[PDB]
């Protein structure tokens, strides 16, 4: 059975615990005899698991707050409903979306900062946005701010309602742990609710609202004399006479007469060439199967009565040819650890948020999305840095599972162990696949300069060189160009139009997507992608398996997840610890999606985005110089670097001046990071007492003692302003050449 | 209320409130005196 | 022959030389008296 | 007091791990540690895995003294029983190693000599230019 | 006893104890024709001696090395062709 | 290998030794402290280096005191 | 005084791992720290130290020279100074293109050459020497000197 | 010219370094309290602290304002 297991008033409401600083833990709950007190009171802030050593307070925490941070982003939300009402051009952007620039954010003319609202169109002086927030209200079906405005008043109450229910869900009733541990219940409503009439209303929304509207704006209508979505729900005359299919009802649905409903739950695959994005028609008939799929999943796992499963007695009895055997204790782990579920949601999570990236650039969903292409090389860039971040979430979670939340004696699973004793092998083996990798991609890369600087293009790996075609991922799109015709023959056209044939979806002066050509440099840089990404996994699988134990320090475990070292000993264990791992898999997560979003970008410059003339001839931004410049690190840094970064230099005077702007502050803090993780605490310490020296000197000495900030700290301070300054440098340059460009 | 002006006197709350006022009292002043490159006033 | 002088002695000092200091060294380096 | 004088006592159940005595015990010095478990239980092993130590003696050989020194403090701190690990070299001499005098090093007992020890304030070692050309060093007078 | 139900510890079998085991070193007899063995043998034995073997491999790798690269045309290698084009004039004149 | 020289300033509290992964050192008689006890240090052949031994001194700056100096294949940790 | 490669130090030579290697390469000309070290032989192997380093900073210049003398347009140079480019030395790079030979091909040479960016040419022709035959005159001495 | 000033100024200022290094090589390896006590020299460690503090001031002051401006001006 399943209950419902809460307890009244376990927390008293009140700003006592405001006033004491650090009160959560035995330690902090002191006061600051330095100033690394306020250090460890902000880094151990989140960590309930080093608070209270019981599930069951740590699961009411965490549930809270996951209340909080849905409130904040029902408030960044409505936010952003608010701005793109009352601070945007959504109207004209609605009227015409090809030559006005989405905007929905405008500056106070105080020091200058106005000359940030530039021209982007409309009779509206503002900040270019990049969030695609205008295609998904077109998506929508919106045509007036009152709906913006109403939106962003539901958000701020449902982001009252989420503060609310997490303040209610602590301090007032709040489950106990036999509401959390069962899982079957939580799966079932995440799939069958949350997720099956997820999709469910919104492609209600989308058959009611989205598809009428955007049928007429694609018919050629002013958005001010559009009939309102209720009209279409009330008047059945108004929406027969847009698909006569809902003039008979939901008798062609109860009788399953679904063929007459082909009028708008089409699988027209491919994308609308009215507008760029995809068939609006086939995205509802989506949301509506995936609904179907995931309310048949959502009725898979038992929970009170005695159809379902068992995920435990799916586990336990999961026999196979390759250690089957095992499966057993993971749901005794995934039901105690709140990180292991962490990491494996994080790391699920992530490579959703990647999936997503690459499917939006593709399969453009929104309409005049793959025209802005600010906003397409944002979204990417954005989901594919998220998608990293989130899966090297995922290796510190592993890691403090590992560390933390692992006993063999009570929680064993045969798997782990298994994992565990044979890690040298997998760390070994990954580690020779990534030398092998980082050989046989960027050494490609060596021998292209090499060659081209000696005179020898002859010798490179190029097309019009030694070629390395990619001959599986050209056979892929030489299949799925010819797919719809014999193995999916319900579509018209192909899922996407990245594999081939003679279709070239232009809304205006603007390609969105062509079909992208795979040579010899996208081989290369596919393998570059490979290599990143291989020793992501090799830096942060590591930390995982040697968060206990190894050859070097047999007792890991009892140093905990997240310290320095073990001192200069066994020559040196300096970043031994597994957050040191996560530390150093961030700079590789860093390298690897700064390399993704440049392919991404560059690519897309060359073979897809660009110009379509009266003639039929496609002119690109960069003009398709990636099959022979993106082979040398060369060309990287002249026909992509240095050629791309003109925009964001030359972006002073004109609303992009910010972007260039931050560029050099990114380029700076990036930088900045560089004194923090080239140095080390003990020469800080000494230069502060120096200056402790000058401050007892004036009788202006602190009681909070300045310290050096910790080892681990100036490692993850390093790390995030490493981060920051690199990845607000790209933001700045992408943002700039495109805006500037496209 | 008790406790709660503790809370808004420790030093982050304090320090946003203080920049707070402050970055308002400068950008009222650049409002009012913008582009100030010289003291005339004597 | 002195056009022909690179050519003798560019790989006598860069691979020649570099081969047998490499190995006289590597010697040095694992000796044991 | 006497050594224990390591026997042919039986070893953990254990499936195997690619962390044991590679080279270190072919060549050079490895190790083995013996503790007297009351219970059959399973305990976290320093080379990566978990083991079950069986009831009465048991008896694993590790490949540096820090593994041998860490399962033992797990051992006494955890399962509360009394270890004991030795160092045998390739050609034999097993060596008795961990109490040394048969209680624990925390435990002051007599007869045990000071070794490594100056009877100075650490501030008080004379510079380095006092011991310069000579084979001492600054905290060796 | 090393044979025992889990000892792993025979202190006079240490061979068995610290891995000294050939994974994989077969003392199978000799698998080839022993007149080939006779001729590999003694065609080979020259190179036998390690300090004659180190000698002769310099002096002869630095010989060969320094010989083909000498009488090397200028078909194998460009560099030494020479330029084979008017050579162009530098900026500001040729400085 | 290493060089692990101890002080008179030791108070007897035995962490060091609780702290040591490698039995460097061990408490000895002593009088010259209130727990008349003190940290001797014979095998500083077995010592990796860790300094856990002196960060857990809890004297004005320390009594136990490792110097790091040739490095054997004890004292760099090596199972291999 | 040790065993291993660095014999000046018997605490890197007893060292099984590599670090042996690195460290005494590194601690090489730190004579201060070296066993069985006096005064005495701490200044002598300076004083020998700075002759090496004399012999080899006359090499280099006589290799200089000698590269100017050989491989070098310093007779044309001389003539035309402001509108003739230096060379500091050939290049027989066999990985180089023919492309690559056409380029490097400057100051009117036979073949491909490096433009010599050092100013030996001008504080050279400003010193005097001025024909070719003083720069092998010039290297040879620096050779002597070496010696 | 360029070739060679930055060749010298590269050059003078890892010499500058090294003399600085030396001077710590010095003050460790060679430097006697006891046969130099109280002189100039010893006085330079009686208050080292003032030194590195008003150094600490200066390259602190020059940072903010240079950057200040730099930015300012950005
Ligand atoms: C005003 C109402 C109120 C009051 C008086 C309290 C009072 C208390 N809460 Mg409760 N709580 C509330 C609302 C309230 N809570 C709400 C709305 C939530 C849902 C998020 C929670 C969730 C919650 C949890 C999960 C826990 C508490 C705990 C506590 C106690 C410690 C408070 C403390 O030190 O943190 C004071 C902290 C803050 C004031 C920080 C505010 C952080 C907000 C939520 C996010 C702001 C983020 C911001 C947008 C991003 C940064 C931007 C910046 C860089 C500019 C105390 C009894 C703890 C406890 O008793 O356990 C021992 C505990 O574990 N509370
Ligand atoms: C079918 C019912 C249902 C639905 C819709 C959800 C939906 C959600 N749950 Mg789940 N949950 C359910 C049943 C359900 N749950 C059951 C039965 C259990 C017990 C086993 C849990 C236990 C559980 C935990 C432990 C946690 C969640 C969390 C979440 C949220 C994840 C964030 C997200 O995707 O944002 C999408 C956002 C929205 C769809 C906006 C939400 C707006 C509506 C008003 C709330 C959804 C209905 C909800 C169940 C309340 C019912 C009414 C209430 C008055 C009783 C999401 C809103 C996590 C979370 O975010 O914490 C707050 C979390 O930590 N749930
Ligand atoms: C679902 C997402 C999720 C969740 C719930 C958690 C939850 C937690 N993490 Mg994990 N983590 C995540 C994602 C997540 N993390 C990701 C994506 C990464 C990769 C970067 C990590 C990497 C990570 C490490 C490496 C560690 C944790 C730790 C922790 C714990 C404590 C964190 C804390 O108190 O800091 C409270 C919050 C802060 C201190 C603020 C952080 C400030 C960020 C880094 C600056 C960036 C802000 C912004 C983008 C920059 C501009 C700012 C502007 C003002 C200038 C807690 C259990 C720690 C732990 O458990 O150790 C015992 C730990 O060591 N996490
Ligand atoms: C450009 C800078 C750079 C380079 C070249 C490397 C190189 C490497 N890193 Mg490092 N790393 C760097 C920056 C860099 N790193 C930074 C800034 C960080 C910050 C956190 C790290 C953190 C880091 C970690 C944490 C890890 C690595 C790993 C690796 C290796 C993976 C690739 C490999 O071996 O393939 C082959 C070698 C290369 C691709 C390197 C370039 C060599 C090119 C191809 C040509 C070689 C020419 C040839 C040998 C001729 C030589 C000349 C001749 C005279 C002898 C390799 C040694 C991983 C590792 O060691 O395990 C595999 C690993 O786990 N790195
Ligand atoms: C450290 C370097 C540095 C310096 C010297 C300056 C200097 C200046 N900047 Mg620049 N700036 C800098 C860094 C710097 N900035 C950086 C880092 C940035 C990026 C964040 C900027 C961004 C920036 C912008 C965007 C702008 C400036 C502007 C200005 C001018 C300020 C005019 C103003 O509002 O003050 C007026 C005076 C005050 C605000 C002080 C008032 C103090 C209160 C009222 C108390 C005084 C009275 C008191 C009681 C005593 C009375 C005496 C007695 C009766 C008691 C001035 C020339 C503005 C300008 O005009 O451009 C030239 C402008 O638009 N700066
Ligand atoms: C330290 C000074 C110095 C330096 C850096 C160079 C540098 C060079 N010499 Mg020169 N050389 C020097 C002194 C120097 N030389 C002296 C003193 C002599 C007279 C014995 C020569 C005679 C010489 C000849 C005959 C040749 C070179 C060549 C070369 C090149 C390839 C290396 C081989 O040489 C071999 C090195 C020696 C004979 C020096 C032994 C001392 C290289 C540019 C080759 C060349 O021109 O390539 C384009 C070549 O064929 N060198
Ligand atoms: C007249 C110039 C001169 C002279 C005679 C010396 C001589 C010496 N230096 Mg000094 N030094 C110099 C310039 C000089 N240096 C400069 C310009 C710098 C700044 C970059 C330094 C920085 C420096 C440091 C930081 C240290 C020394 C040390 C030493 C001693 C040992 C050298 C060693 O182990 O490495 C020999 C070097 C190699 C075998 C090559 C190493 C590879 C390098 C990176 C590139 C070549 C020796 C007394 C060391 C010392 O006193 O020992 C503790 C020491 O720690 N020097
Ligand atoms: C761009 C990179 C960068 C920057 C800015 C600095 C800056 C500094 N370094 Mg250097 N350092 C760097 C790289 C850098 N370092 C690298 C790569 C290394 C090698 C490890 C070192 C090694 C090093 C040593 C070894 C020492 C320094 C020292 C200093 C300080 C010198 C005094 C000065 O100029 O202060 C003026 C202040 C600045 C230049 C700081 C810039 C930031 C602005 C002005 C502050 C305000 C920004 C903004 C409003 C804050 C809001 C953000 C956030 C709260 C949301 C200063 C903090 C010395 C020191 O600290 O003693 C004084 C010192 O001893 N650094
Ligand atoms: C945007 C947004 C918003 C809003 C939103 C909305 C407005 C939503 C809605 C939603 C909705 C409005 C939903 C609905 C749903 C429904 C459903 C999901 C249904 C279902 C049904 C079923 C399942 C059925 C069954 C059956 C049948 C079939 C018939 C008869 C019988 C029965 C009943 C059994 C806000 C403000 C928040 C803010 C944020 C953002
Ligand atoms: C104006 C003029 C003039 C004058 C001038 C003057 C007077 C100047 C001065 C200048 C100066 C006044 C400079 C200085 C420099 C310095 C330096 C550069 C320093 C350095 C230092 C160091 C490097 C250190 C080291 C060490 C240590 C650390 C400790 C131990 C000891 C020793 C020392 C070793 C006349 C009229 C004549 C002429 C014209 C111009
Ligand atoms: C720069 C640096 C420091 C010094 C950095 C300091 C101590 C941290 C920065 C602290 C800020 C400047 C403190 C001041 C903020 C206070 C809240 C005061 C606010 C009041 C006014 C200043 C507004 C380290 O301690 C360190 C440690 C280990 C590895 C690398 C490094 C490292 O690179």
């Given at each position: 059975e399943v209950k419902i297991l809460v307890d009244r008033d376990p927390i008293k409401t009140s700003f006592e615990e405001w006033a004491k600083p650090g009160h959560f833990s035995r330690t902090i709950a002191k006061g600051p005899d330095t100033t690394t007190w306020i250090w460890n009171l902000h880094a151990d802030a989140h960590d309930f698991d080093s608070h209270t050593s019981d599930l069951e307070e740590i699961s009411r925490k965490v549930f809270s707050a996951h209340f909080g941070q849905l409130s904040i982003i029902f408030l960044w939300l409505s936010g952003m409903y608010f701005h793109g009402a009352r601070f945007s051009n959504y109207e004209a952007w609605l009227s015409d979306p090809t030559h006005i620039g989405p905007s929905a954010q405008v500056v106070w003319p105080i020091v200058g900062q106005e000359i940030l609202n530039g021209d982007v169109g409309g009779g509206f002086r503002g900040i270019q946005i990049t969030s695609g927030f205008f295609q998904i209200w077109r998506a929508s079906g919106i045509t007036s701010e009152l709906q913006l405005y109403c939106t962003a008043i539901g958000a701020l109450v449902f982001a009252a309602l989420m503060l609310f229910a997490g303040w209610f869900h602590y301090h007032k009733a709040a489950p106990k742990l036999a509401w959390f541990?069962?899982?079957?219940?939580?799966?079932?409503?995440?799939?069958?609710?949350?997720?099956?009439?997820?999709?469910?209303?919104?492609?209600?929304?989308?058959?009611?609202?989205?598809?009428?509207?955007?049928?007429?704006?694609?018919?050629?209508?002013?958005?001010?004399?559009?009939?309102?979505?209720?009209?279409?729900?009330?008047?059945?005359?108004?929406?027969?006479?847009?698909?006569?299919?809902?003039?008979?009802?939901?008798?062609?649905?109860?009788?399953?007469?679904?063929?007459?409903?082909?009028?708008?739950?089409?699988?027209?695959?491919?994308?609308?060439?009215?507008?760029?994005?995809?068939?609006?028609?086939?995205?509802?008939?989506?949301?509506?199967?995936?609904?179907?799929?995931?309310?048949?999943?959502?009725?898979?796992?038992?929970?009170?009565?005695?159809?379902?499963?068992?995920?435990?007695?799916?586990?336990?009895?999961?026999?196979?040819?390759?250690?089957?055997?095992?499966?057993?204790?993971?749901?005794?782990?995934?039901?105690?650890?709140?990180?292991?579920?962490?990491?494996?949601?994080?790391?699920?999570?992530?490579?959703?948020?990647?999936?997503?990236?690459?499917?939006?650039?593709?399969?453009?969903?929104?309409?005049?999305?793959?025209?802005?292409?600010?906003?397409?090389?944002?979204?990417?860039?954005?989901?594919?840095?998220?998608?990293?971040?989130?899966?090297?979430?995922?290796?510190?979670?592993?890691?403090?599972?590992?560390?933390?939340?692992?006993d063999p004696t009570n929680r064993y699973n045969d798997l782990l162990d298994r994992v565990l004793r044979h890690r040298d092998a997998i760390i070994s083996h990954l580690n020779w696949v990534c030398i092998f990798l980082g050989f046989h991609s960027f050494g490609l890369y060596i021998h292209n300069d090499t060659m081209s600087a000696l005179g020898r293009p002859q010798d490179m790996f190029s097309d019009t060189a030694i070629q390395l075609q990619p001959v599986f991922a050209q056979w892929i799109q030489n299949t799925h160009a010819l797919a719809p015709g014999v193995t999916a023959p319900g579509e018209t056209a192909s899922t996407s139009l990245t594999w081939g044939g003679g279709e070239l979806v232009a809304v205006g002066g603007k390609v969105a997507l062509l079909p992208i050509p795979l040579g010899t440099a996208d081989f290369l840089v596919h393998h570059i992608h490979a290599f990143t990404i291989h020793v992501t996994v090799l830096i942060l699988l590591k930390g995982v398996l040697f968060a206990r134990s190894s050859r070097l320090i047999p007792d890991k475990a009892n140093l905990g997840f997240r310290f320095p070292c073990d001192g200069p000993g066994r020559g040196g264990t300096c970043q031994v610890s597994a957050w040191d791992h996560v530390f150093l898999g961030l700079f590789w997560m860093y390298n690897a999606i700064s390399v993704v979003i440049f392919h991404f970008s560059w690519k897309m410059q060359s073979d897809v985005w660009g110009s379509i003339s009266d003639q039929g001839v496609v002119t690109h931004i960069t003009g398709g110089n990636f099959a022979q410049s993106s082979i040398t690190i060369?060309?990287?840094?002249?026909?992509?670097?240095?050629?791309?970064?003109?925009?964001?230099?030359?972006?002073?005077?004109?609303?992009?001046?910010?972007?260039?702007?931050?560029?050099?502050?990114?380029?700076?803090?990036?930088?900045?990071?560089?004194?923090?993780?080239?140095?080390?605490?003990?020469?800080?310490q000494e230069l502060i007492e120096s200056i402790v020296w000058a401050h007892n000197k004036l009788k202006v000495a602190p009681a909070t003692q300045p310290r050096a900030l910790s080892i681990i700290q100036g490692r993850a301070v390093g790390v995030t302003h490493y981060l920051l300054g690199g990845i607000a440098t790209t933001w700045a340059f992408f943002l700039a050449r495109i805006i500037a460009v496209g | 209320m008790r406790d709660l002006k503790t809370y808004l006197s420790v030093a982050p709350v304090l320090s946003t409130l203080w920049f707070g006022s402050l970055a308002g009292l400068l950008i009222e002043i650049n409002r009012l005196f913008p582009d100030a490159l010289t003291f005339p006033f004597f | 022959t002195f056009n022909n002088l690179p050519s003798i002695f560019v790989p006598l000092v860069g691979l020649v030389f570099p081969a047998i200091a490499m190995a006289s060294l590597f010697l040095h380096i694992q000796k044991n008296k | 007091?006497?050594?224990?004088?390591?026997?042919?006592?039986?070893?953990?159940?254990?499936?195997?791990?690619?962390?044991?005595?590679?080279?270190?015990?072919?060549?050079?010095?490895?190790?083995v540690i013996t503790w007297n478990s009351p219970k059959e239980q399973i305990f976290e092993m320093p080379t990566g895995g978990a083991a079950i130590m069986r009831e009465g003696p048991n008896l694993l050989k590790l490949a540096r003294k820090e593994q041998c020194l860490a399962l033992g403090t797990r051992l006494r701190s955890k399962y509360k029983i009394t270890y004991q690990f030795y160092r045998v070299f390739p050609n034999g001499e097993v060596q008795y190693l961990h109490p040394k005098d048969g209680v624990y090093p925390e435990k002051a007992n007599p007869g045990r000599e000071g070794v490594g020890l100056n009877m100075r304030s650490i501030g008080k070692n004379v510079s380095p230019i006092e011991v310069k050309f000579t084979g001492k060093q600054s905290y060796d007078l | 006893k090393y044979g025992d139900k889990s000892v792993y510890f025979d202190l006079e079998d240490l061979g068995n104890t610290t891995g000294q085991w050939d994974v994989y070193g077969s003392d199978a007899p000799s698998p080839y024709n022993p007149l080939q063995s006779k001729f590999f043998e003694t065609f080979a034995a020259p190179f036998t001696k390690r300090g004659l073997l180190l000698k002769f491999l310099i002096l002869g790798g630095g010989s060969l090395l320094t010989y083909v690269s000498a009488n090397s045309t200028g078909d194998v290698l460009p560099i030494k062709r020479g330029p084979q084009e008017p050579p162009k004039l530098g900026p500001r004149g040729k400085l | 290998s290493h060089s692990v020289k101890i002080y008179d300033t030791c108070i007897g509290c035995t962490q060091c030794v609780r702290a040591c992964p490698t039995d460097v050192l061990e408490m000895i008689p002593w009088d010259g402290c209130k727990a008349k006890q003190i940290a001797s240090a014979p095998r500083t052949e077995d010592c990796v280096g860790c300094k856990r031994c002196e960060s857990a001194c809890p004297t004005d700056f320390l009594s136990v005191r490792v110097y790091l100096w040739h490095e054997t294949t004890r004292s760099m940790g090596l199972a291999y | 005084m040790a065993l291993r490669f660095p014999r000046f130090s018997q605490g890197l030579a007893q060292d099984p791992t590599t670090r042996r290697i690195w460290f005494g390469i590194a601690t090489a000309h730190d004579f201060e720290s070296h066993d069985d070290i006096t005064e005495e032989r701490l200044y002598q192997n300076i004083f020998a130290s700075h002759f090496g380093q004399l012999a080899i900073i006359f090499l280099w210049t006589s290799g200089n020279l000698f590269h100017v003398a050989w491989q070098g347009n310093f007779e044309t140079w001389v003539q035309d100074p402001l509108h003739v480019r230096p060379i500091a030395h050939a290049i027989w790079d066999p990985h180089f293109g023919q492309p690559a030979v056409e380029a490097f091909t400057r100051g009117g040479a036979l073949g491909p050459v490096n433009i010599a960016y050092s100013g030996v040419y001008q504080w050279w022709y400003t010193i005097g020497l001025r024909t070719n035959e003083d720069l092998y005159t010039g290297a040879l001495f620096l050779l002597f000197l070496s010696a | 010219q360029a070739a060679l000033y930055t060749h010298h100024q590269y050059i003078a200022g890892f010499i500058m370094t090294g003399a600085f290094a030396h001077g710590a090589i010095f003050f460790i390896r060679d430097y006697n309290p006891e046969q130099n006590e109280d002189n100039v020299l010893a006085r330079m460690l009686d208050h080292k602290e003032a030194i590195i503090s008003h150094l600490s001031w200066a390259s602190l002051f020059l940072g903010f304002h240079t950057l200040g401006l730099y930015v300012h001006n950005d």
């Amino acid at each position: 059975e399943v209950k419902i297991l809460v307890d009244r008033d376990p927390i008293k409401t009140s700003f006592e615990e405001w006033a004491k600083p650090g009160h959560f833990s035995r330690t902090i709950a002191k006061g600051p005899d330095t100033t690394t007190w306020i250090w460890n009171l902000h880094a151990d802030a989140h960590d309930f698991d080093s608070h209270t050593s019981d599930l069951e307070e740590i699961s009411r925490k965490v549930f809270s707050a996951h209340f909080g941070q849905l409130s904040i982003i029902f408030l960044w939300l409505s936010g952003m409903y608010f701005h793109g009402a009352r601070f945007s051009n959504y109207e004209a952007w609605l009227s015409d979306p090809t030559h006005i620039g989405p905007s929905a954010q405008v500056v106070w003319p105080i020091v200058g900062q106005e000359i940030l609202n530039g021209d982007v169109g409309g009779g509206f002086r503002g900040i270019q946005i990049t969030s695609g927030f205008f295609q998904i209200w077109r998506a929508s079906g919106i045509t007036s701010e009152l709906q913006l405005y109403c939106t962003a008043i539901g958000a701020l109450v449902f982001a009252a309602l989420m503060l609310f229910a997490g303040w209610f869900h602590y301090h007032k009733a709040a489950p106990k742990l036999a509401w959390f541990q069962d899982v079957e219940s939580m799966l079932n409503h995440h799939l069958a609710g949350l997720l099956g009439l997820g999709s469910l209303s919104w492609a209600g929304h989308q058959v009611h609202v989205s598809l009428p509207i955007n049928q007429f704006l694609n018919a050629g209508v002013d958005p001010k004399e559009i009939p309102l979505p209720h009209e279409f729900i009330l008047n059945r005359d108004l929406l027969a006479q847009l698909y006569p299919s809902f003039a008979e009802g939901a008798t062609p649905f109860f009788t399953l007469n679904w063929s007459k409903y082909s009028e708008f739950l089409t699988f027209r695959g491919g994308l609308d060439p009215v507008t760029g994005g995809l068939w609006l028609t086939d995205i509802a008939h989506h949301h509506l199967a995936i609904a179907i799929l995931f309310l048949i999943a959502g009725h898979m796992y038992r929970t009170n009565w005695g159809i379902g499963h068992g995920i435990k007695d799916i586990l336990e009895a999961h026999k196979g040819p390759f250690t089957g055997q095992g499966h057993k204790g993971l749901y005794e782990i995934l039901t105690t650890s709140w990180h292991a579920q962490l990491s494996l949601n994080l790391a699920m999570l992530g490579s959703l948020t990647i999936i997503v990236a690459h499917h939006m650039y593709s399969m453009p969903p929104y309409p005049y999305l793959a025209t802005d292409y600010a906003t397409q090389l944002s979204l990417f860039t954005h989901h594919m840095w998220i998608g990293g971040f989130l899966i090297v979430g995922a290796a510190a979670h592993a890691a403090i599972f590992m560390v933390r939340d692992y006993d063999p004696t009570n929680r064993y699973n045969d798997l782990l162990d298994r994992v565990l004793r044979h890690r040298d092998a997998i760390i070994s083996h990954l580690n020779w696949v990534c030398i092998f990798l980082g050989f046989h991609s960027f050494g490609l890369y060596i021998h292209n300069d090499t060659m081209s600087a000696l005179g020898r293009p002859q010798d490179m790996f190029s097309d019009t060189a030694i070629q390395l075609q990619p001959v599986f991922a050209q056979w892929i799109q030489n299949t799925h160009a010819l797919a719809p015709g014999v193995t999916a023959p319900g579509e018209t056209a192909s899922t996407s139009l990245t594999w081939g044939g003679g279709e070239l979806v232009a809304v205006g002066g603007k390609v969105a997507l062509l079909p992208i050509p795979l040579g010899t440099a996208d081989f290369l840089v596919h393998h570059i992608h490979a290599f990143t990404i291989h020793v992501t996994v090799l830096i942060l699988l590591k930390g995982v398996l040697f968060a206990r134990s190894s050859r070097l320090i047999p007792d890991k475990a009892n140093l905990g997840f997240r310290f320095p070292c073990d001192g200069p000993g066994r020559g040196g264990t300096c970043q031994v610890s597994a957050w040191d791992h996560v530390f150093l898999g961030l700079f590789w997560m860093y390298n690897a999606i700064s390399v993704v979003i440049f392919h991404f970008s560059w690519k897309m410059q060359s073979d897809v985005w660009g110009s379509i003339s009266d003639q039929g001839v496609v002119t690109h931004i960069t003009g398709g110089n990636f099959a022979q410049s993106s082979i040398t690190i060369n060309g990287w840094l002249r026909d992509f670097l240095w050629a791309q970064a003109s925009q964001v230099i030359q972006s002073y005077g004109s609303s992009l001046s910010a972007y260039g702007l931050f560029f050099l502050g990114a380029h700076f803090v990036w930088a900045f990071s560089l004194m923090f993780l080239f140095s080390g605490r003990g020469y800080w310490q000494e230069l502060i007492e120096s200056i402790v020296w000058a401050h007892n000197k004036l009788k202006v000495a602190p009681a909070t003692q300045p310290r050096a900030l910790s080892i681990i700290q100036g490692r993850a301070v390093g790390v995030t302003h490493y981060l920051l300054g690199g990845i607000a440098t790209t933001w700045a340059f992408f943002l700039a050449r495109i805006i500037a460009v496209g | 209320m008790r406790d709660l002006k503790t809370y808004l006197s420790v030093a982050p709350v304090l320090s946003t409130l203080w920049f707070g006022s402050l970055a308002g009292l400068l950008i009222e002043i650049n409002r009012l005196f913008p582009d100030a490159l010289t003291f005339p006033f004597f | 022959t002195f056009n022909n002088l690179p050519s003798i002695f560019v790989p006598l000092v860069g691979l020649v030389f570099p081969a047998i200091a490499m190995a006289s060294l590597f010697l040095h380096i694992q000796k044991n008296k | 007091t006497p050594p224990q004088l390591d026997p042919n006592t039986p070893s953990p159940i254990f499936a195997g791990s690619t962390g044991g005595l590679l080279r270190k015990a072919q060549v050079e010095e490895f190790y083995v540690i013996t503790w007297n478990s009351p219970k059959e239980q399973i305990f976290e092993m320093p080379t990566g895995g978990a083991a079950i130590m069986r009831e009465g003696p048991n008896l694993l050989k590790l490949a540096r003294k820090e593994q041998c020194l860490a399962l033992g403090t797990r051992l006494r701190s955890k399962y509360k029983i009394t270890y004991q690990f030795y160092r045998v070299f390739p050609n034999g001499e097993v060596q008795y190693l961990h109490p040394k005098d048969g209680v624990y090093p925390e435990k002051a007992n007599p007869g045990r000599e000071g070794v490594g020890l100056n009877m100075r304030s650490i501030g008080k070692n004379v510079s380095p230019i006092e011991v310069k050309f000579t084979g001492k060093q600054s905290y060796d007078l | 006893k090393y044979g025992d139900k889990s000892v792993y510890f025979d202190l006079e079998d240490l061979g068995n104890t610290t891995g000294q085991w050939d994974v994989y070193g077969s003392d199978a007899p000799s698998p080839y024709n022993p007149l080939q063995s006779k001729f590999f043998e003694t065609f080979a034995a020259p190179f036998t001696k390690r300090g004659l073997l180190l000698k002769f491999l310099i002096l002869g790798g630095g010989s060969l090395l320094t010989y083909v690269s000498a009488n090397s045309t200028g078909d194998v290698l460009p560099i030494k062709r020479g330029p084979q084009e008017p050579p162009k004039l530098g900026p500001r004149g040729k400085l | 290998s290493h060089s692990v020289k101890i002080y008179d300033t030791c108070i007897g509290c035995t962490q060091c030794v609780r702290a040591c992964p490698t039995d460097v050192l061990e408490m000895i008689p002593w009088d010259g402290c209130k727990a008349k006890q003190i940290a001797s240090a014979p095998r500083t052949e077995d010592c990796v280096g860790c300094k856990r031994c002196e960060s857990a001194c809890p004297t004005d700056f320390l009594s136990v005191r490792v110097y790091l100096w040739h490095e054997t294949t004890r004292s760099m940790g090596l199972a291999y | 005084m040790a065993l291993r490669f660095p014999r000046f130090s018997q605490g890197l030579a007893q060292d099984p791992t590599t670090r042996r290697i690195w460290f005494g390469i590194a601690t090489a000309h730190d004579f201060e720290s070296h066993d069985d070290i006096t005064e005495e032989r701490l200044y002598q192997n300076i004083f020998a130290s700075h002759f090496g380093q004399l012999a080899i900073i006359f090499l280099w210049t006589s290799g200089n020279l000698f590269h100017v003398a050989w491989q070098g347009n310093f007779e044309t140079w001389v003539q035309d100074p402001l509108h003739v480019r230096p060379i500091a030395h050939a290049i027989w790079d066999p990985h180089f293109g023919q492309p690559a030979v056409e380029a490097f091909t400057r100051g009117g040479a036979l073949g491909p050459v490096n433009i010599a960016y050092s100013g030996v040419y001008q504080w050279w022709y400003t010193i005097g020497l001025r024909t070719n035959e003083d720069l092998y005159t010039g290297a040879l001495f620096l050779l002597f000197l070496s010696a | 010219q360029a070739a060679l000033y930055t060749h010298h100024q590269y050059i003078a200022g890892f010499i500058m370094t090294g003399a600085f290094a030396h001077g710590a090589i010095f003050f460790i390896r060679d430097y006697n309290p006891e046969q130099n006590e109280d002189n100039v020299l010893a006085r330079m460690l009686d208050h080292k602290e003032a030194i590195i503090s008003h150094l600490s001031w200066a390259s602190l002051f020059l940072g903010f304002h240079t950057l200040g401006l730099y930015v300012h001006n950005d």
